[PDB]
Amino acid sequence: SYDRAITVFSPDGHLFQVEYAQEAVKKGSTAVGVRGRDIVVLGVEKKSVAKLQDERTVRKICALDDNVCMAFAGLTADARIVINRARVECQSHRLTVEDPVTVEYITRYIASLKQRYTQSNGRRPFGISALIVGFDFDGTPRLYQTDPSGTYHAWKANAIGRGAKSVREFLEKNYTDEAIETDDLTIKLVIKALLEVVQSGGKNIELAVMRRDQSLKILNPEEIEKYVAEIEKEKEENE
Amino acid sequence: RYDSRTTIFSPEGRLYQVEYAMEAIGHAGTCLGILANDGVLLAAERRNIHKLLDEVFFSEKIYKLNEDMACSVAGITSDANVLTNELRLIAQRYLLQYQEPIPCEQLVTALCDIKQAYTQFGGKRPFGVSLLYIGWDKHYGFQLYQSDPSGNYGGWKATCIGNNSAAAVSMLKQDYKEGEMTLKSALALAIKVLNKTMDVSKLSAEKVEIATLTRENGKTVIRVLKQKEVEQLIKKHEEEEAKAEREK
Amino acid sequence: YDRGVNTFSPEGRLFQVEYAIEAIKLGSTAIGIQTSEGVCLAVEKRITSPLMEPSSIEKIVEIDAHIGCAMSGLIADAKTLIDKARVETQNHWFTYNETMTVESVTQAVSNLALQFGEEDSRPFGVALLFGGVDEKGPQLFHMDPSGTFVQCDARAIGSASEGAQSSLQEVYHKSMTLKEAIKSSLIILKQVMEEKLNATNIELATVQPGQNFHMFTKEELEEVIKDI
Amino acid sequence: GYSFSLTTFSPSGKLVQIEYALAAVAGGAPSVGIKAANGVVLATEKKQKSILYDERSVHKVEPITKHIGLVYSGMGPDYRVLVHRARKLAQQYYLVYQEPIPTAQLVQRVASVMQEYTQSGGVRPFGVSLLICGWNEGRPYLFQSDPSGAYFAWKATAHGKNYVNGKTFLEKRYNEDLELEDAIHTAILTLKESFEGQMTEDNIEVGICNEAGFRRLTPTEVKDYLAAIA
Amino acid sequence: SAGFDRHITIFSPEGRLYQVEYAFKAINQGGLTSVAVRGKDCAVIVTQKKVPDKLLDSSTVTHLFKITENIGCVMTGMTADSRSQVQRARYEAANWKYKYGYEIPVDMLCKRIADISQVYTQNAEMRPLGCCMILIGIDEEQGPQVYKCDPAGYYCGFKATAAGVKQTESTSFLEKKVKKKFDWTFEQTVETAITCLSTVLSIDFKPSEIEVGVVTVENPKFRILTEAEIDAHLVALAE
Amino acid sequence: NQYDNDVTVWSPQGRIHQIEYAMEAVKQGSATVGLKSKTHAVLVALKRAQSELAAHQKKILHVDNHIGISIAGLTADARLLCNFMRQECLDSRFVFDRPLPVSRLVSLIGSKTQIPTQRYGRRPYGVGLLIAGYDDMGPHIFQTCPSANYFDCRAMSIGARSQSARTYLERHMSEFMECNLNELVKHGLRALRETLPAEQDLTTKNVSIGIVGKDLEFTIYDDDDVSPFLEGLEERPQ
Amino acid sequence: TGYDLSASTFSPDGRVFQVEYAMKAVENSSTAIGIRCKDGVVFGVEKLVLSKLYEEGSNKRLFNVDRHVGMAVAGLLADARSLADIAREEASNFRSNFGYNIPLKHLADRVAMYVHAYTLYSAVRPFGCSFMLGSYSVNDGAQLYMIDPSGVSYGYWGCAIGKARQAAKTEIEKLQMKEMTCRDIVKEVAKIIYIVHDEVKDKAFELELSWVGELTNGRHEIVPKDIREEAEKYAKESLK
Amino acid sequence: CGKTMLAKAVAHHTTAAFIRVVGSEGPRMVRDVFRLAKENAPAIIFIDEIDAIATKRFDAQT
């Protein structure tokens, strides 16, 4: 009994179609998220804006809460589907529950939706993975990752997509156990990887920041290039 | 087998059926939306070729969703017809709720989400329709958008799909025009691209179907071009190529 | 005979659920011990990178103040089964005000598990240990994708189940103190399973009849570390 | 190939089964429909395989409304289904709007029906192609609706056996300024040109749309055009 | 060849519905012929009654049925499929009688039966019924009608027809009878039918071997002819 | 094979081999014995051991103060059927305060098990059941199989290695009719011991007993309860 | 193999070869016979014994259809039990609706439709059994109808199903059921069953008789053969 | 109807050799057929009821 299906097991017992979903995630572009001392920062790469393709429309970064933000790496159609579902869920939870939304609940929601969609015949799993950053961890930053197997884990700093093998090791090389003083330092550190992954072009670092109390914050390419120049000065020290 | 059903990925994670849908799109009659300012256009030469075809609508490629919204067709015919009708009902839903013209990006999403929902269920076939939208709204005004079978959507100032789509987009990138590139220059560039992509010498008026959106009185007007203006534009491009020869 | 459970082999066995047992085998190892002092459970995290929060992987959980759990397998739907167990305890206690017997909790989880060919999906490819205390006895119980379930004194599931089970069988007897059981289980885990004990990959949870609080082990492992 | 199922694409993005439906079309009885200047004429072949079959007891030209006529080239039962559906759809349009349904609207509704039969994994499309003749606001319309769910505008067309011969014939022998009588003459001429075997009152049947009303010609009139003429 | 005939809702490369022609084989059902002839004021059906074993009750093995005081029906096909089809005929006749206030015309009843057979033809849910039915009726001051109704969903009215073991021989014999100018009485019509059956079958035709149903404008009740009447006709054609 | 995937498909043999494969799945279960007298109906099950530190699995279930079962099959199917008998006896006691007769319960079991055996994509219920009861008409022992067939047996044994037990029951059928509860239960215990290999014999680990009588509610005796029944019974010499 | 895989597609040589497999299953079962005497209908069935384990008079194959309608079956036993259940349901439906006992022609035709319609659908299979129904209407006559797995319903003066269709019919053909009455019909039936392989190869079996007659009140009862066992004596005298 | 008959007649009257293969009879077979034709210069090849192999092309599955 070979894989050939979603709801059947090979004699080993692993659902290879879930593996195919995770490889479908692997074929997507880079996405590396972190949490800092107080703030959470993100920068997406591989914009590859081709002239008439005005880069704003595709919306590489989506903020779906009073304050929470992420798009989805993989195939973007299911990304926007989970976007609509996240909008509905966050607004409905804020309306119905005695207290507003927390990042843990919404991450569990996404994981459960992915699992429930997967757990049936004739229903394609979302081949999409995401990195969620939220503020209301009792007023503290925390980062989560969601995987098409319907799984959710917590990270101090994680990378998924085309750089998953590389950037993660980069993080394992330099994620300071010292809580990042001057969260702009964490922003420079993450911008370094977000650039170096895509040829450090300086054009696709498209970035968002939230200090775990603020609403959504965005970084324009010039202000991000400021952190890029600081990182270049830090790297030039070896002389 | 993997590609026999829409619910199965590749071991690489790819989905063959949507790829087959874009290969199908590769057949479609060449259609573009041109780069323009203070106006937009979506030229679509009709691939239908038989003198006994009556073209009683004068339009079989451009469908007006509203007097500030129009969309094209490149793909399966019945699927495109039902999808354009569904565009009309979704725009009617939004208008009947809010009494406000729908933003371009919101309608684009709603349709692409519906298409994706159809694809990702089993026992159902993905829509083999790629299509372009031109529209004006409160948030961004003049907009042209691309949509594919998988439910993807994107923003493009100028784009083309159908036969020789790669050639059309490549030459649009070659003679890219920006800024002062107003509507009439966009008509001229559409004439150029339709002449280059098609095999016909002295491009015939009945082979081409052209539409454009212009903000009249702030109420907006979408025109589907008649014979006379098409003849004038194509003849002008012919004599413009002659002028380009005059430099030699 | 490959499409699902609704096909029988020449020997009668269904060629779908044995693969779910092997799906148990691909998961992280998990251990459970039943003693008259308290019921204990242990689990290996397989923390992929310490940059993860080690507590994030919910491979050790508390269903309720008297009952804790561990699992091995695909993990993803194991959390769903823990959710069912928690809703079972909540509903039954709020209605009847009598404590749910851990036997009954396992029975309810089994009743959920029997919903892949018994109505109108696929077996839950994961196995579970429950450890609980009740007004009539402290018990430990085991659950597998087939929906059958058994009371055991010293149980092991997941990867390396056979060797860990052999050592656990050899160390067990009926009058052990929970301290000696815990130390024997931990040293077994150290020798056969991965490596020396540390807070970022091992987990222990124990429950006693007179204690409805702190059914976990947390931020106190240091005494063991120097004295294991 | 990719024909045993309808709801899956081919690698070339071809819905193979519906082209098999189109191949079922043009294997049936010949039929030709031409728009004149004033009227719209649809002619079809009705030879009985033997003297047993009663030529006056069955019809193939059908009035959906008193201003709409339908002719087909395919197996009969599916055509009966779509005739029933078209009649009910025209009547429901009349109930909704209190207006007689124009040709184009009825045509697109029937095309949408033939569309809804083009999906799912346990059904098949109709193996029939249809000519719709109609009068709307003083304008004559001829339309073709085909198993794919699409439809086309024709001043003249034909399908069935020897249909390419019909395309050539109406390409050569046609102009849009045709009077009604010459249009029916062209219709019988192309029917014969596609035809094999004799043709009389009992062998052919035709339907004419005129803006005042549509009607199916009696066998005697079909003979009057059919014989002693041409 | 194999593949376009394993399931019903599949078109062949030439567009052939294999299963329709395939069900057309079971119409053979060696043992019945069902020849029906129309005369100037009458409609006659005769079927061949091939009884394999003696112990069966003769009345139970009949193949002629009635759905209206003025409508007669006959069957050629699998007997169970036969009885199901005639039962659906009773269902439709009763519903039309209730809804419109008067009994269903024979042409509309053939249309309804062919409609259901076409319904099972177009949809893969249910097998098409392997049987062919023939109806005789009267319509007001305008004439007697003979109608054949087939599993393909096709139907037509005839001067005469026969779906039987000697298909082409019976049909050509009836054509030969009708392609020579003659009148049509009740006895003449029954004589034509009986001569067709006897000549195509060449058997000596004892009375129990055939069953005759009839309707006539002077007595529009549908009747099954008794053995005495059929033997009187047999000796009339014999002498 | 071409004709062995679903019960909806007949074989040219005039058989449904999938139903036979369900029978084989039943045979995979351990042996169980059932026997009745004019005084009591008793069933006994061979509880398969899993380890020296795990509970020997339960194979006799209690659903009614006068009705009991012994199973041999996939535990899920048998236990959900057990819930089905729970439902029917409870609703019968609701309807007319009657302890549900065993024969009609077994007939309902067969009728419900028949539905999967004739429909596509739904497994027939791969368990064999022995049912014991006492009712206003007599003592009753029935056996039910995935073919939805149900039988009444004065003595019966279903499961692996059963043939020796069935022969023993054939021999002692001439006894059971007028035997007393003690005689019947000891003969049933020996019937089970007939199944076992030479080195395996009756013990509290592997043995479960259930008894229904004209003067006692059907009770399942396990663990300590089994000890007095086995003690005093003849051991096995070689 | 061809296209004979389900009973919803016409296999080659249009006969499905599926419901014919159901008939093949019917042939595997033991014989049942049914006679109509001058004023009654009698059924006689043999049934295998499992072993000395088996409880006497168990899993018997005569079944009650209705207070006046009796059943005999052959083929798959459990399918026959389900058929008895649905037949009882149909009889109860008519009894509740019309307010009087159902004519056996109508009930037999409705059960024939049930079997036939079950033959069609792809998710289901034809019944692997064939059966006779018998009854007496004191108002006008007696009635018997036999139905096959295909749904074909016909009436008989004498009929047989099982592993000995034609041989049993030869045995029955030379009885005088034309005028003979049921009291010796039971003896004739028992001896006829014993004639066709009573215990020649199959070691032991049980013989069960059912009856519906005006002298039997026209209701359905199991014949009290415990009374002096005259039919049993006759059937065992059949030895030579 | 005489499709093979007239071909055979032509083969007899002319100096040609007549090689025949029916379409029901993979590509190596066609190669061998044309090669065996090459061995005799005036020889004729005949395909009988070819249509089975020459049926309209499309996306092939198996």
Curated annotation (Swiss-Prot), chain A:
Record lineage = Eukaryota, Metazoa, Chordata, Craniata, Vertebrata
* Biological function: Component of the 20S core proteasome complex involved in the proteolytic degradation of most intracellular proteins. This complex plays numerous essential roles within the cell by associating with different regulatory particles. Associated with two 19S regulatory particles, forms the 26S proteasome and thus participates in the ATP-dependent degradation of ubiquitinated proteins.
Glycosites: 129
Q: What is this protein called?
A: Proteasome subunit alpha type-7
* Domain of life of the source: Eukaryota
Q: Which residues are recorded as modified (N6-acetyllysine)? A: 226
Which terms are listed as keywords in the entry?
Answer: Acetylation, Cytoplasm, Glycoprotein, Host-virus interaction, Nucleus, Phosphoprotein, Proteasome
Compartments where found: Cytoplasm; Nucleus
Complexes and interactors: The 26S proteasome consists of a 20S proteasome core and two 19S regulatory subunits. The 20S proteasome core is a barrel-shaped complex made of 28 subunits that are arranged in four stacked rings. The two outer rings are each formed by seven alpha subunits, and the two inner rings are formed by seven beta subunits. The proteolytic activity is exerted by three beta-subunits PSMB5, PSMB6 and PSMB7. PSMA7 interacts directly with the PSMG1-PSMG2 heterodimer which promotes 20S proteasome assembly. Interacts with HIF1A. Interacts with RAB7A. Interacts with PRKN. Interacts with ABL1 and ABL2. (Microbial infection) Interacts with HIV-1 TAT protein.
Where does the UniProt entry say this protein principally localizes? cytoplasm
UniProtKB/Swiss-Prot annotation, chain D:
Cellular compartments per GO CC: cytoplasm; cytosol; extracellular exosome; extracellular region; ficolin-1-rich granule lumen; nucleoplasm; nucleus; P-body
* Residues recorded as bearing Phosphotyrosine in the entry: 2, 20, 72, 117
Residues carrying Phosphoserine: 3, 10, 12
Compartments where located? Cytoplasm; Nucleus
Main location as per UniProt: cytoplasm
Q: What is known about its induction?
A: Down-regulated by antioxidants BO-653 and probucol. Down-regulated in response to enterovirus 71 (EV71) infection (at protein level).
User: Per the UniProt entry, what is one GO biological process?
Assistant: response to virus
For this protein, what post-translational modification is recorded in UniProt?
Phosphorylated on tyrosine residues; which may be important for nuclear import.
Q: Which cysteines are joined by disulfide bonds?
A: none
Coiled-coil residue windows: none
Q: Which SMART domains match?
A: Proteasome_A_N (SM00948)
Keywords of the record, alphabetical order, are: Acetylation, Cytoplasm, Nucleus, Phosphoprotein, Proteasome
InterPro entries attached to this UniProt entry = Ntn_hydrolases_N, Proteasome_alpha, Proteasome_alpha-type, Proteasome_asu_N, Proteasome_sua/b
NCBIfam families from the xrefs? Answer: PRK03996.1
Q: What does this protein do?
A: Component of the 20S core proteasome complex involved in the proteolytic degradation of most intracellular proteins. This complex plays numerous essential roles within the cell by associating with different regulatory particles. Associated with two 19S regulatory particles, forms the 26S proteasome and thus participates in the ATP-dependent degradation of ubiquitinated proteins.
What family does the Swiss-Prot or TrEMBL record give for this protein?
Belongs to the peptidase T1A family.
Protein name listed in UniProt: Proteasome subunit alpha type-2
Native species:
Homo sapiens
Swiss-Prot record, chain E:
Residues bearing the modification N6-acetyllysine? 97, 99
Task: List, alphabetically, the InterPro entries matched.
Answer: Ntn_hydrolases_N (IPR029055), Proteasome_alpha (IPR050115), Proteasome_alpha-type (IPR023332), Proteasome_asu_N (IPR000426), Proteasome_sua/b (IPR001353), Proteasome_subunit_alpha6 (IPR034642)
Q: Where does the source fall among the domains of life?
A: Eukaryota
PROSITE patterns, A to Z: PROTEASOME_ALPHA_1, PROTEASOME_ALPHA_2
Q: Where in the cell is it found?
A: Cytoplasm; Nucleus
Q: Name one GO cellular component term.
A: extracellular exosome
Q: Which residues carry this modification: Phosphoserine?
A: 12, 58-59
Q: Give the GO biological process terms.
A: positive regulation of canonical NF-kappaB signal transduction; proteasome-mediated ubiquitin-dependent protein catabolic process; proteolysis involved in protein catabolic process; regulation of inflammatory response
Q: Which UniProt keywords apply?
A: Acetylation, Cytoplasm, Glycoprotein, Nucleus, Phosphoprotein, Proteasome
Which Pfam family is an annotated match for this chain, by its short name? Proteasome
Answer whether the UniProt record assigns the keyword Manganese to this protein. Answer: no
> Where in this protein does the record say Phosphotyrosine is found?
154
Task: List GO molecular-function terms, semicolon-separated.
Answer: endopeptidase activity; NF-kappaB binding; purine ribonucleoside triphosphate binding; RNA binding
SMART domains, per the entry: Proteasome_A_N (SM00948)
* SUPFAM superfamilies recorded: N-terminal nucleophile aminohydrolases (Ntn hydrolases) (SSF56235)
Q: What is the similarity comment for this entry?
A: Belongs to the peptidase T1A family.
Per UniProt, subunit arrangement is: The 26S proteasome consists of a 20S proteasome core and two 19S regulatory subunits. The 20S proteasome core is a barrel-shaped complex made of 28 subunits that are arranged in four stacked rings. The two outer rings are each formed by seven alpha subunits, and the two inner rings are formed by seven beta subunits. The proteolytic activity is exerted by three beta-subunits PSMB5, PSMB6 and PSMB7. Interacts with ALKBH4.
Gene this protein is translated from: PSMA6
From Swiss-Prot, chain H:
Where is this chain's protein located in or outside the cell?
Cytoplasm; Nucleus
Describe the task this protein carries out: Component of the 26S proteasome, a multiprotein complex involved in the ATP-dependent degradation of ubiquitinated proteins. This complex plays a key role in the maintenance of protein homeostasis by removing misfolded or damaged proteins, which could impair cellular functions, and by removing proteins whose functions are no longer required. Therefore, the proteasome participates in numerous cellular processes, including cell cycle progression, apoptosis, or DNA damage repair.
| Family as reported in the entry's similarity comment | Belongs to the AAA ATPase family.
What is the annotated quaternary arrangement, including any partners?
Answer: Component of the 19S proteasome regulatory particle complex. The 26S proteasome consists of a 20S core particle (CP) and two 19S regulatory subunits (RP). The regulatory particle is made of a lid composed of 9 subunits, a base containing 6 ATPases including PSMC4 and few additional components. Interacts with NR1I3. Interacts with PAAF1. Interacts with TRIM5. Interacts with ZFAND1.
**Name the UniProt record assigns to this protein:** 26S proteasome regulatory subunit 6B
Q: Which organism is it from?
A: Homo sapiens
The root-end lineage is: Eukaryota, Metazoa, Chordata, Craniata, Vertebrata
